[PDB]
Amino acid sequence: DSKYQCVKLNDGHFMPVLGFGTYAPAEVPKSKALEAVKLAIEAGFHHIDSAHVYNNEEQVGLAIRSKIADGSVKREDIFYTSKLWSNSHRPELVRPALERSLKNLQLDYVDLYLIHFPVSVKPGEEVIPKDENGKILFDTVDLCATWEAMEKCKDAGLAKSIGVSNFNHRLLEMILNKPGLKYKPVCNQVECHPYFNQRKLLDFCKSKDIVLVAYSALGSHREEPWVDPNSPVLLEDPVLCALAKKHKRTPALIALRYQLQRGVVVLAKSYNEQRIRQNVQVFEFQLTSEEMKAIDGLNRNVRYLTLDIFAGPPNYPFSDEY
Ligand SMILES: NC(=O)C1=CN([C@@H]2O[C@H](COP(=O)(O)OP(=O)(O)OC[C@H]3O[C@@H](n4cnc5c(N)ncnc54)[C@H](OP(=O)(O)O)[C@@H]3O)[C@@H](O)[C@H]2O)C=CC1
Known part of the structure; x- marks a missing residue:
């Protein structure tokens, strides 16, 4: 249909409340990302989430370009998200990273650009740079400077909205x-x-x-x-x-x-x-207050993704309570 559920962001833009994730384990051929995104759009997903680090933007971009070119959907009805990987946290490298992603996607802009993870690593093509002894090459960067560069990307029209990911209370307040x-x-x-x-x-x-x-x-x-x-x-x-x-x-x-x-x-x-078509059924029913409370009770407070290889530097986000 022409309408769908969205929420108003603090910058005036609207975000569809159901997004399609595109990350898939290495063993999975990238070609699958292309087919999956086309099906997601066909099923009714209007929010597509990716990142430079997923190494699938060429495929994800094609899917989007394809569904727009054949009349299935208009660019303004697709909310695409990319993320700035940690090897480009340095201010002067932020826009070049966004522009690289856009080139891979063959899109003019991204609807949302996020700082992917708060821990920085040394510049270069390698996403997880390591020295000769296997040690990750951490970098010291002021995220507030990274953010200013993100803001400039928004003002340039390259990113409609900007946000973060894996940030804790301290980092957000910062x-x-x-x-x-x-x-x-x-x-x-x-x-x-x-x-x-x-x-x-x-x-x-x-x-x-x-x-x-x-x-x-x-x-x-x-x-x-x-x-x-x-x-x-x-x-x-x-x-x-x-x-x-x-x-x-x-x-x-x-x-x-x-x-x-x-x-x-x-x-x-x-x-x-x-399962792709099944997921959009989330808009076909509702849960009662009691059911919601029953689900609240399931909290185990155990995190699935700790990404501890990035633990050590001050910006590691999962040490604090929240
Ligand atoms: N910003 C960040 O740091 C991170 C962001 N992400 C984002 O989050 C997205 C989703 O996360 P993950 O990738 O963690 O995925 P999910 O937790 O959303 O899905 C986990 C598994 O659920 C299965 N599944 C999907 N629909 C159904 C269904 N209806 N019934 C039963 N099983 C189902 C899928 O298998 P199958 O494909 O076989 O259907 C999939 O492998 C990513 O693709 C990525 O875009 C992920 C990690 C980190």
Whole structure:
């Protein structure tokens, strides 16, 4: 249809509340990203989420360009998000990174550009640069300077809105309390699901009118060594399955709806045609206050993606309570 559910960002732009995630483990051919995004748009997704580090923007861009060129959708009805990887946190390297992504995508602008992760690494083509002894080559960069460069990208029209990802309370306050701040981040994309519902960070973001965008909302890709294979399987949870049976939906759908009813914009990744179409069903039903509370009770406070290889530097975001 021509209309769909969106929320107003603090900069006046609108973000579709259901986004399609495009990250897929290395073993998965990039060609799959192309097919998956086209199906997502066909199914009704109007929000597509990617990043330079996913190494799929050429494919994701083609999918978008294809669905626009054949009349399926208009550019203004696609909300595309990219992210600035950590090897380009230095002010002077921010715009070149966005322009590189745009060249790969063959798009004129991105609807949203995020600082992907708060820990910086040395400049260069390598996303995770290491010295001869395997040590990650960390870099010292003032994120407030990185943000000013992000703001300039917005003023240049290259990015409609700018936000962050994997930022904690301290880091957000740092950007928000920054002298001469021109644009607040429109969002903070972080891991969020029933086992880690981010209640505290969520309320903080709400008090500043920052949209919290949940990733790994279905339990994550569970790809090693990024995620502990011993971690509980979210969609297998008994309460979610009970609710699924009750509503005649699926555990995945219950988990996605949960986020939508607590004011959270949710992402959902899937390269399976049937599950892709299934996910848009999140707009076909609603959960009661009691069901919502039952899901709140599932919080385990255990994080799936710690990205500890980036632990050590002061900016590592997951040490603080939130
Ligand atoms: N900014 C950041 O730091 C990060 C952002 N992300 C973003 O979040 C997105 C989603 O995260 P992850 O990638 O963590 O994905 P999700 O947690 O959304 O999905 C996990 C798994 O759910 C399966 N699934 C999808 N739909 C259903 C369904 N209806 N029923 C049962 N299983 C289902 C998928 O399998 P299948 O494909 O076989 O259907 C997929 O492997 C990414 O693609 C990326 O865009 C991810 C990590 C970090």
